[PDB]
């Protein structure tokens, strides 16, 4: 099983960026997708319940497109690497990586 990503992104302050991943080559069903950084939670997409968006990001993150998410009003402090953690039924755990650079 493999994950393909948007690819590393360079954006400017105040811009908007989509972070998306695609799970390929697997017979596994996706129960939940966690969007995270090394130390913080951005959003979770759960198949049974729905989306959860961490209060830190509720002003500038919208669910979608698909199992991805959209960032508004990019700041330089966003510069970092973002993870799309796919939790599949029931073995689980596929991981994708996307670095965003701002200025």
């Amino acid at each position: 099983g493999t994950i393909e990503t948007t690819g590393n992104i360079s954006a400017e302050k105040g811009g908007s960026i989509i972070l998306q991943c695609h799970l390929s080559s697997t017979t596994a069903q996706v129960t939940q997708v966690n969007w995270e950084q090394q130390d913080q939670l951005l959003a979770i997409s759960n198949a049974d319940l729905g989306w959860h968006i961490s209060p830190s990001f509720k002003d500038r993150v919208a669910p979608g497109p698909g199992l991805g998410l959209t960032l508004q009003s990019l700041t330089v402090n966003d510069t970092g690497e973002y993870f799309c953690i796919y939790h599949t039924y029931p073995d689980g755990t596929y991981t994708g990586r996307i670095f965003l650079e701002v200025l």
Partner: antibody, heavy 117, light 113 residues
């Protein structure tokens, strides 16, 4: 202009852990990522990871999980790299290099680290 | 991980010639916004690696105009209009579109005889 001075060469015994420094000058140190490259056998290049000095965020090549640790001291525009539990296979030159739009436009002179018993 | 296969690994050359290095990527180096983060690097023996060309075709500040870069998708090329004794060394292609960043194998320019 943009200058990146790395620390000197070091011979250590296997099992030891040492810290390489990279003092930056000539640019806003927190506005750019500080990357680290390994040069093996004189020929092969390997991207080890980077640190974004503005907020301390790190990203690591997972082929080398737990081999390096990246830190910065912003009050001295110094980036650091701690190599851990070194073996002979880790005898190489380790480069400091600034990151701009996913290219490395300025490099340090390199730090030759030798591991031998 | 993207595997950057570089070709040839060694090239004996004549000063005044036109050299071409091809870098071939195991998958597309374009993000969803059409930015392709491929750079070319040069490491002369006495020195530290220096950036020559970034994002396929853009020439870094200070690089002679003999150096030019082309290609798209999954194969890229470095053009040297006229090689001088100072152009010798080892050349590397690097992709930074996909974590982790991976380098090419490297091409070593030599003297033909």
């Amino acid at each position: 202009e943009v200058q990146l001075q790395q620390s000197g060469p070091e011979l250590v015994k296997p099992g030891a852990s040492m810290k390489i420094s990279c003092k930056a000058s000539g640019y806003s140190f927190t506005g750019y990522t500080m990357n680290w490259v390994r040069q093996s056998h004189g020929k092969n290049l390997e991207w080890l990871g980077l640190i974004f000095p503005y907020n301390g965020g790190t990203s690591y090549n997972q082929n080398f999980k737990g081999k390096a640790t990246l830190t910065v001291d912003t009050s001295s525009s110094t980036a650091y790299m701690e190599l851990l539990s070194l073996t002979s296979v880790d005898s190489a030159v380790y480069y400091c290099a600034r990151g701009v739009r996913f290219a490395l436009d300025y490099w340090g002179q390199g730090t030759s680290v030798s591991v031998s018993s | 991980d993207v595997v950057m296969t570089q070709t040839p690994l060694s090239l004996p050359v004549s000063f005044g010639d036109q050299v071409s290095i091809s870098c071939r990527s195991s998958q597309s180096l374009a993000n969803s916004y059409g930015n392709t983060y491929l750079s070319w690097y040069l490491h002369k023996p006495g020195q530290s690696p220096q950036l020559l060309i970034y994002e396929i075709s853009n020439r870094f500040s200070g690089v002679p105009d003999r150096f030019s870069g082309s290609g798209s998708g999954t194969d890229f090329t470095l053009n040297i209009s006229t090689i001088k004794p100072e152009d010798l060394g080892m050349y590397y292609c690097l992709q930074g579109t996909h974590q982790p960043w991976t380098f090419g194998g490297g091409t070593k320019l030599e003297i033909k005889r």
